[PDB]
Amino acid sequence: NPAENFRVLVKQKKASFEEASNQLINHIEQFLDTNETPYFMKSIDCIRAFREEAIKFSE
Amino acid sequence: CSLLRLQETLSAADRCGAALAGHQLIRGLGQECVLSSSPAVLALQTSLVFSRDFGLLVFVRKSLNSIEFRECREEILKFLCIFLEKMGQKIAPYSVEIKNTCTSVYTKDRAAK
Amino acid sequence: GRTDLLRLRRRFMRDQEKLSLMYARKGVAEQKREKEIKSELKMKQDAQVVLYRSYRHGDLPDIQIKHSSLITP
Amino acid sequence: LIRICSKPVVLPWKVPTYKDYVDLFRHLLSSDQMMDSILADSLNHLLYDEFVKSVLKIVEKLDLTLEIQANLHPAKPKDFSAFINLVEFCREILPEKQAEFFEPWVYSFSYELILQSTRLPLISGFYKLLSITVRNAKKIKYFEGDPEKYSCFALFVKFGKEVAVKMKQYKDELLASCLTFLLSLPHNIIELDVRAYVPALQMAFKLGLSYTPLAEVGLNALEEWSIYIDRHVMQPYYKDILPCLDGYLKTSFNKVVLKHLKKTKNLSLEE
Amino acid sequence: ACDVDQVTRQLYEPLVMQLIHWFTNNKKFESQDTVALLEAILDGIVDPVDSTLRDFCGRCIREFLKWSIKQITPQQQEKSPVNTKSLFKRLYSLALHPNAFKRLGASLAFNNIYREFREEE
Amino acid sequence: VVVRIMEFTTTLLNTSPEGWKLLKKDLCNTHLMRVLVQTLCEPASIGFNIGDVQVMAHLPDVCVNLMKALKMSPYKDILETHLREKITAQSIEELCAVNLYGPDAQVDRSRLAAVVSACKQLHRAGLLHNILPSQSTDLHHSVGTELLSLVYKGIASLDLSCKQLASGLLELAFAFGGLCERLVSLLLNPAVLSHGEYFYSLFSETINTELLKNLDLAVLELMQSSVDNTKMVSAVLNGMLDQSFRERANQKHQGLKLATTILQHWKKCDSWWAKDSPLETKMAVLALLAKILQIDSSVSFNTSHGSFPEVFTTYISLLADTKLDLHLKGQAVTLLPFFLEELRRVLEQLIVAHFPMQSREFPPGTPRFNNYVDCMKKFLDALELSQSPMLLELMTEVLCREQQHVMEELFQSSFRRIARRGSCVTQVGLLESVYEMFRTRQSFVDRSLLTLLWHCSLDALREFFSTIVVDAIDVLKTFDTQITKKMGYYKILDVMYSRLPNELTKTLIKLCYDAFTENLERRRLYHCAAYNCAISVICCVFNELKFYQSTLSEEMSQFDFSTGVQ
């Protein structure tokens, strides 16, 4: 749900935004004892989308 | 009640000089204030005409430069303040004469003080 | 002095705020004010009537009673 | 009103009461002086009408069921407690307002109350509220000898005479309401057959001798008949009613400091 | 004894029951108990007011006659001028009086005494 | 005298049937017919009859008994002729068209009310068209039209007397048949100022009272209206459901019947269903169907009993609507206790889409945060009413993803409120489910199991233990997973040791006392846990010091149900 939030956050300013890296690390890391296969699919979609976003401009 | 005796004494307490008379006056005024500070339903009615005669007395006699009268003046102004605040709007007959006395007090020889 | 628990726990203010306690104090004062109001409203009526002679109960009257029982009323 | 009447009564976090709302409703009914200013950037009568219709429909909705185990055994005690709470609340919230707005209901509402009283002629709150409405009607001077007015006259005289003949057989806390109503009638209708009212007022003042409110309401009612009736029929029962009046005639912080006395900023039997 | 107050009556009715139980005694069964009982009748049977007095004295006289019958030997009380028969004549005359107060007093007194008279055979 | 001779005639007609009416026929005139009709129409039109007490209060029904008795009697022809002479609905048709509103005339209002009462008594006597024949059709449509015209020109108002007169005229129209489509057309008036809505807001009580007699024809008419009509159809069904819930003294099967009809009479009009209506229309329709569901029993249409699959699938779809707001979605959720895997999986994926990361990222006062707190409290209420096991598992899973990130005190309070509710076997099913899903995972037991155990029932605890005896015994024998599983097992056994002394526990004393025997803080927690277990085994055994060292309430509830919130 904050995925689109930092998507528009890195779209509006396009800085280095390692905070986005921390946010995606947090999103992925919530996986230790209970499987989250729908959340897992959401997570992989978000990391892919930010992957092309990073490919896009500078990072 | 005793306020009649007290007003008589205060009217009789400004014959000579002897500013100790003014001390008797201020102490007395303290007692009549606290006696009439909290009437139940009745003593206020007598207290109204007592205020009438006392304002008359201070207007006609306590009209000089003696500080023994000046301290009486300030204390009775505060005293009338608290009575009229307590008594509310029931002193309509005495309002215009109180205004006359108060304007006189401003125009009194105390205007040099 | 067996009630030292109350005195030891009476003033543990340290984990509390000052003006919050002040508001609590003044609110308590307000409730005491209307408590006094209702108390004097209750006291408006006459004071409680007190008797002056203890009354025994039975199916036959008890003439054997003290002289106080009649003199005090 | 359902929530207000829902609160129980116990007599000898804090549990609230029911008497606190009286100033709220008084403000609701007399806040014209500021609702006009609110309108700047009538309707009080409309909310009065809504209140009246709501309370009447709700009181007529409520069941009044008792049991046999003379013995008074209500069958729905919680409903009866809510009933007494609401009836006490309504009898204390009406006096400060004027029944000029209540004027449409003086026939129909009173008729419904008469029906309810005929259903159960043992409810003190019935006579409390009837006294309230009838003093409201006499305050607004509704009685003038309109078919609705004549119907009200007939209803009132019938109810008065029947409750006068029935109150002799009632008990305390119940006949007190009846006699309170009886003294609370307007003079014109009770110009007739003072023979019924004389013992009623006699026992009314007899009870007032130990319970003041009955005494002063009887005083007001008495002075009312004294002023508003011809003396012809006044003479005969005076020799009966005056001797009972022999009762009540056996009787026997702050300092020099000036702080404007904020203690004083705020606002029986000898009476 | 029928006044509208708590402590007053709360001690009054014990007194009236106490005196009733004393006057029921067969040693002094006659010549003064008659006055007490006739007054305890005429109070509530004859009054335009205070129906509480009427029912209270009806209960009182019901208890009085109950105490008399349970306590006193019968032959004494029927040989006494006062008995249930005198009460019968009082009620029978009382119903026929033109005054409604007298008739309703008779009715209420009979309603009180029925619960004990029904056991009589 | 009048009332007594009247009831005497009633007794003569009823106790002595028409084979014995010849004695009355011997009177040969029955001249009382020409006074009694005035008596019915007006007490003033007869002897005084004033008094306004039980005698003339009970005059109408005994009079109706008289009219029925004469209706059997052959005198009924002349009696009906005299009734027509006294009133023919043509002597009164102009009298109701005099614009009685305002304080202009009141005797007209009085006489109109009197004739209304007389003919409603005739209805109680069963005399509607035999005495007042209708038009070419089978209605008297003029009354509703004149009511609508009067209320239109009333503001372009009324009185309480006018209000009750209008209600009387409404029930007079209700005495006739076929009025359902008429009133549907009247309420469908789009005259703006609308006007049919104004009429409904005036006389909803009378409208719903009449349409309670209708069962499906009203449902059909509102169906055909529902192609574009939305607000007024919602209002009329609200009136239906409110009156059905209100009527209990007779029965409550009216609500069941209407619910069955409308479920069978909805599927042809689904312009509320799915994305074809505004959002406000969607919350309106979900709230009203929620009221419908709470009317009927849960068992009624919990499985395939009719249109249940369609409405259930629509429930699923509307809750799967991403465009639907999360708070409104939860409001629709709140009626889950009337309910297979499909709902569970769509719910889990939606709540995954709804709650990304705890509550810290949602600041206090943030609208998302407030929607979240509303959601969790309404799931708490829903599970309190439903105790759904897999849904309890979902609540635990979303709950136990961070300590104190969420209002866990509400959750444990709900745990207390549900542990004493439900069947003991059902509760044990919940316990074994939450135990299985346990296999940090410690958060599960820590935040739920002690609470549910201390609020559980004795027999349920006994049977659950007897289920899990060896399932714990084996467990007694990276490694952090083993440590956490041991944490859970020691805590649950420690919790349940306060009930009663198989009897194979003779070694568990050492098996839990072995804590302090051996010599990162995980192990400190381990020793503390096992020592607590020792405490629990000791507190029950070996007393010696050898341990090997209402009516108004109903009305308020009905008002809340009409509100739908509490």
XYZ file of N, CA, C and O in Angstrom, chain D residues 1-9 16-29 48 51 54-55 59 80-97 109 125-126 128-129 132 135-136:
216
model
N -35.708 11.325 25.304
C -36.559 11.200 26.479
C -36.593 9.761 26.973
O -36.693 9.526 28.182
N -36.507 8.792 26.056
C -36.446 7.395 26.464
C -35.192 7.144 27.285
O -35.237 6.488 28.333
N -34.058 7.686 26.838
C -32.816 7.529 27.585
C -32.902 8.206 28.946
O -32.398 7.676 29.944
N -33.533 9.380 29.007
C -33.625 10.105 30.272
C -34.490 9.337 31.263
O -34.103 9.120 32.417
N -35.670 8.900 30.821
C -36.561 8.153 31.699
C -36.025 6.766 32.015
O -36.456 6.158 33.000
N -35.095 6.257 31.207
C -34.533 4.934 31.439
C -33.703 4.867 32.712
O -33.506 3.772 33.247
N -33.212 5.995 33.199
C -32.398 5.986 34.406
C -33.253 5.632 35.615
O -34.319 6.228 35.811
N -32.831 4.682 36.441
C -33.611 4.315 37.624
C -33.442 5.339 38.739
O -32.639 6.268 38.659
N -34.229 5.147 39.795
C -34.198 5.998 40.976
C -33.888 5.130 42.186
O -34.583 4.139 42.440
N -24.455 9.180 36.743
C -25.149 10.458 36.569
C -26.598 10.365 37.040
O -27.098 9.304 37.403
N -27.269 11.516 37.021
C -28.659 11.605 37.451
C -29.559 12.046 36.305
O -29.122 12.121 35.152
N -30.824 12.321 36.616
C -31.798 12.761 35.631
C -32.188 14.221 35.786
O -32.677 14.819 34.823
N -31.978 14.810 36.958
C -32.404 16.174 37.232
C -31.511 17.226 36.592
O -31.863 18.409 36.615
N -30.369 16.832 36.030
C -29.429 17.809 35.498
C -29.901 18.436 34.196
O -29.445 19.529 33.851
N -30.805 17.783 33.473
C -31.174 18.218 32.133
C -32.211 19.332 32.133
O -32.567 19.829 31.056
N -32.695 19.736 33.308
C -33.808 20.675 33.375
C -33.394 22.043 32.840
O -34.156 22.699 32.117
N -32.169 22.479 33.148
C -31.682 23.742 32.608
C -31.440 23.640 31.113
O -31.638 24.617 30.385
N -31.006 22.467 30.647
C -30.858 22.238 29.217
C -32.176 22.465 28.496
O -32.239 23.208 27.512
N -33.248 21.843 28.985
C -34.536 22.017 28.317
C -35.084 23.429 28.484
O -35.717 23.957 27.560
N -34.845 24.060 29.637
C -35.259 25.450 29.805
C -34.566 26.349 28.792
O -35.197 27.228 28.191
N -33.267 26.135 28.579
C -32.552 26.878 27.553
C -33.096 26.564 26.168
O -33.248 27.469 25.340
N -33.385 25.290 25.895
C -33.953 24.923 24.603
C -35.241 25.674 24.332
O -35.497 26.084 23.196
N -36.057 25.866 25.357
C -37.342 26.511 25.162
C -37.290 28.026 25.306
O -38.265 28.695 24.945
N -41.286 22.802 20.533
C -42.214 22.563 21.632
C -43.326 21.611 21.208
O -43.674 20.672 21.936
N -41.939 18.111 20.894
C -41.792 17.523 22.218
C -43.130 17.048 22.761
O -43.228 15.945 23.309
N -44.363 13.934 20.881
C -43.532 12.788 21.217
C -43.871 12.254 22.599
O -44.055 11.044 22.782
N -43.976 13.144 23.588
C -44.215 12.667 24.943
C -45.603 12.052 25.052
O -45.777 11.025 25.713
N -46.078 8.167 26.104
C -46.747 7.785 27.343
C -47.972 6.929 27.048
O -48.280 5.994 27.796
N -42.812 1.185 35.013
C -43.458 2.106 35.940
C -42.456 3.102 36.510
O -42.784 4.276 36.720
N -41.230 2.648 36.777
C -40.186 3.554 37.244
C -39.829 4.578 36.175
O -39.673 5.771 36.468
N -39.697 4.131 34.926
C -39.477 5.076 33.840
C -40.636 6.057 33.744
O -40.431 7.253 33.508
N -41.856 5.565 33.960
C -43.040 6.412 33.912
C -42.995 7.496 34.977
O -43.286 8.664 34.701
N -42.648 7.128 36.209
C -42.646 8.128 37.269
C -41.514 9.125 37.054
O -41.670 10.325 37.313
N -40.372 8.658 36.540
C -39.283 9.579 36.232
C -39.703 10.587 35.168
O -39.497 11.798 35.322
N -40.320 10.108 34.087
C -40.705 11.031 33.028
C -41.827 11.957 33.472
O -41.854 13.123 33.066
N -42.758 11.472 34.298
C -43.849 12.343 34.716
C -43.334 13.421 35.662
O -43.750 14.583 35.574
N -42.394 13.076 36.549
C -41.806 14.108 37.393
C -41.031 15.115 36.550
O -41.137 16.331 36.768
N -40.315 14.634 35.528
C -39.548 15.538 34.682
C -40.463 16.491 33.926
O -40.192 17.695 33.839
N -41.566 15.975 33.382
C -42.437 16.844 32.604
C -43.174 17.825 33.503
O -43.356 18.989 33.130
N -43.585 17.397 34.702
C -44.247 18.357 35.574
C -43.288 19.431 36.067
O -43.744 20.519 36.434
N -41.978 19.170 36.087
C -41.088 20.263 36.464
C -40.578 21.086 35.283
O -40.096 22.202 35.502
N -40.664 20.592 34.045
C -40.153 21.386 32.927
C -41.198 22.290 32.280
O -40.829 23.245 31.583
N -42.476 22.010 32.458
C -43.516 22.879 31.914
C -43.736 24.230 32.602
O -44.097 25.184 31.902
N -43.578 24.376 33.934
C -43.987 25.652 34.560
C -43.294 26.893 34.022
O -43.942 27.941 33.899
N -42.005 26.815 33.688
C -41.298 28.026 33.288
C -41.708 28.515 31.905
O -41.459 29.680 31.579
N -42.329 27.669 31.093
C -42.793 28.083 29.780
C -44.293 28.333 29.782
O -45.028 27.886 30.666
N -54.998 16.424 23.981
C -54.060 15.861 24.941
C -54.750 15.562 26.261
O -54.644 14.452 26.792
N -49.195 10.133 39.199
C -48.594 10.927 38.142
C -49.608 11.443 37.145
O -49.435 12.532 36.585
N -50.674 10.673 36.908
C -51.782 11.157 36.095
C -52.306 12.478 36.634
O -52.417 13.462 35.900
N -50.855 14.506 38.764
C -49.797 15.511 38.683
C -49.808 16.214 37.330
O -49.860 17.450 37.250
N -49.769 15.434 36.250
C -49.718 16.035 34.925
C -51.019 16.748 34.581
O -50.989 17.789 33.917
N -50.810 20.029 36.100
C -49.892 20.858 35.321
C -50.606 21.469 34.117
O -50.546 22.685 33.883
N -53.352 24.106 35.245
C -52.811 25.398 35.648
C -52.217 26.130 34.454
O -52.271 27.361 34.402
N -51.676 25.399 33.476
C -51.227 26.046 32.248
C -52.392 26.707 31.521
O -52.290 27.850 31.057
